[PDB]
């Protein structure tokens, strides 16, 4: 990262600082990385975080300088399409089925998050054009 990148990232990091000490929580590290363009899994986030325990994940605070190596480590298309084509072959996906898989497998998200991101992308049958939804969420 260059000075400009470090400045933009530091500003964003400080926006996530809800205590004023120039720090975020470990549990916020993933959120900051995502705001900065990274897409790590919870497993990946905990690994770059050093597999923190619940207590330090929720209350131990780190400044930007300690966060930065973790961001670096995380930082260092056809599969995405086939992955969506898994759940199709007319280019659609049931809303119920996408909801079920996103709320019951892997690193489960909440139903409200899924409703929020899926709002307006499904048609009257309850089908999502996944190439368009994917381009939208990658933009």
């Amino acid at each position: 990262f260059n000075k400009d990148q470090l400045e933009e990232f530091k500003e964003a990091f400080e926006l996530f600082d809800r205590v004023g000490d120039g720090k975020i929580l470990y549990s916020q590290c993933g959120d900051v990385m995502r705001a900065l363009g990274q897409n790590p899994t919870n497993a990946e986030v905990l690994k770059v975080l050093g597999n923190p325990k619940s207590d330090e994940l929720k209350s131990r605070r780190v400044d930007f300088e300690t966060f930065l190596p973790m961001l670096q480590a995380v930082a260092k298309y056809e599969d995405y399409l086939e992955g969506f084509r898994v759940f199709d072959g007319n280019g659609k996906v049931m809303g119920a089925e996408l909801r079920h898989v996103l709320t019951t497998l892997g690193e489960k998200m909440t139903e409200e998050e899924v409703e929020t991101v899926l709002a307006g992308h499904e048609d009257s049958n309850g089908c999502i054009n996944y190439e368009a939804f994917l381009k939208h969420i990658l933009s």
Partner: protein, 751 residues
Amino acid sequence: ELYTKYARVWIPDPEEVWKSAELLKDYKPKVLQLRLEEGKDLEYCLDPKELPPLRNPDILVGENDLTALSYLHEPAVLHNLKVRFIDSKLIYTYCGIVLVAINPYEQLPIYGEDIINAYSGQNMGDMDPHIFAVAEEAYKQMARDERNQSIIVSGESGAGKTVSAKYAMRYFATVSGSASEANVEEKVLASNPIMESIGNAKTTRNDNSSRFGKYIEIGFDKRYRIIGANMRTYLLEKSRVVFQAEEERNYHIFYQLCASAALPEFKTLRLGNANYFHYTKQGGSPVIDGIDDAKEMVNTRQACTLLGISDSYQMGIFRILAGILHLGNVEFASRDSDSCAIPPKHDPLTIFCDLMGVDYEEMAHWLCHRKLATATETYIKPISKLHAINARDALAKHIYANLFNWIVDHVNKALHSTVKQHSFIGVLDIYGFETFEINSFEQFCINYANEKLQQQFNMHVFKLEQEEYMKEQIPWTLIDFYDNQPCINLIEAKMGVLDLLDEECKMPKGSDDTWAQKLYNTHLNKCALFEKPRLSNKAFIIKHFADKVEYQCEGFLEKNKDTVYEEQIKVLKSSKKFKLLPELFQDSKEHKKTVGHQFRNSLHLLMETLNATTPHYVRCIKPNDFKFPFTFDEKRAVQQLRACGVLETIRISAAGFPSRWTYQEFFSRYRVLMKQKDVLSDRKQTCKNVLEKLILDKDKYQFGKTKIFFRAGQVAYLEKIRADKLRAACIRIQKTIRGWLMRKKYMRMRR
């Protein structure tokens, strides 16, 4: 290997025979790290060798066919019955062709007419399993092809055999159009309590164990409509009449008759309390808990009257049984070392005469002496007390076996109907395999009969599957018969256990000790299936299909002796007083034959009766020990599943190609694995690439023309790799959407 983290395995427990766990760690070629509902994180321990049984995936669990499952082993067969039986309350199940039926104690609605009609059109696969699917396949075979059809039902006597038969009979009556023409059903079900009464006995494991094979023919007109029925019976336990192990009873009808002694009708029989008589006393245990003997009596007799027995024939039969009981109390006093006598005015023989009609003096003389005839001349030879006892017990067994064959044939006179039978379907109820802490001649005969039925069962399955491979154009040499001739040749053949036991019966100064000591020369090192228990010389071990089984010799010789002296039955046959006793002995070596040789012939007729026929199978397993309206208890169900050969049908088929799939359903799930780069015009050709790429060893499966045949275990493997590729996609999407929604939370929060 197949083992990886987030895989599941079966772990042994006392409280139920297995427990489900998940792997916390990958395995490597030691300890495993395990997740359990209680004491959730544990060392697991590895035998210095095996691994825990890997667990089936949850699409397959709960299906109707136990051999559709990918991993086949005791845990999975336990589980898949458990789930339906408590959670679904679906009781009928298929294993290969064999139908597993778990006894409910609640009476389920499902047997009613509407379902019978709904089945009547539909083939063996067209429905979920139910008894009507077997009864239908039998009826369809009989109509589709002349050949008569058997149904065979196996288990402990309290496993609900009778009800599984009764509904099959309803199925025939209702489907055949035949309801007006005859009631077999009312007659069969009204006959049952008689043959339960004379046929059954308490065995220490449970009350009311049937000790004989019971076989029923249901006859049809050439229009495939019912004429009527005919019984036969096989494998009766002739030995039980005179001898019991501790905590066993003689056949119920003796106790019922003795409990009825309060009634005025039986006054002349002078029957004492049920433990006064030497044949009833020996088990020590004259009362079965939970029954009124005298109250069973009135149903027994009502069933006789409803089945057309004379009101005076009933007193005749009881007069004869009372004769046997009085006979047993005869006691011999020795004159000399080598000769013995009945003492003056001995009471029970005096009563046995007034019951049977024969003179006291000629009975008392003939009991004490054998007769020998040369061609020119004859010698009245005296016989030792120890011979005279086995003579009396042989006469008691011979009377009982004849009275039973007469009562069966009068039953047949009621059941039989005079239209000439075009063909028949036949329904058979038999004891399954039997092993107790002690095992004795009764169990050796039961286990021999079981393992001989098991040979026909094996050969029939091997025919059906060599057909199924032939139709679908595999090489059928891929799968090989499994054969228990090496064991039958030990039991049956010359220089075999039954043969050396017949030899030790006739050889002078024979005994159990010298019988075992004569077995241990011939078999013990020479034969791979005969084994000696290490700390004892009175005992021997045989590996059956099911298990190792240890047999004590101690009793085992006395039970084999039968010889009945011609004079002693000729005296009875001459008897004046009443009809039935001459009727019993109506038309040799048959008097010389030993019990084991009579049984070895009876079973061979049962086998000719079945081998005429193309059988169908039902197995009955009693899922809990205490009659609870619904519970499932895995320690019991294991013992049932082993004793009913289900686990051996499975252990055999697991070396097969048990798992068998349509090309369309194979697309139906596994297009997800298939790259649409490759997904292709022709289903039969498309998968040949995919499967041979996913599974690097071609020997593990075969391409049938219309179906695919996998070896055991590689379906769940394909399901694992599908679940992994689904998980990877779920990661990639949840990763994206998590990042997006956190960025939008950041938009909410700043602005």
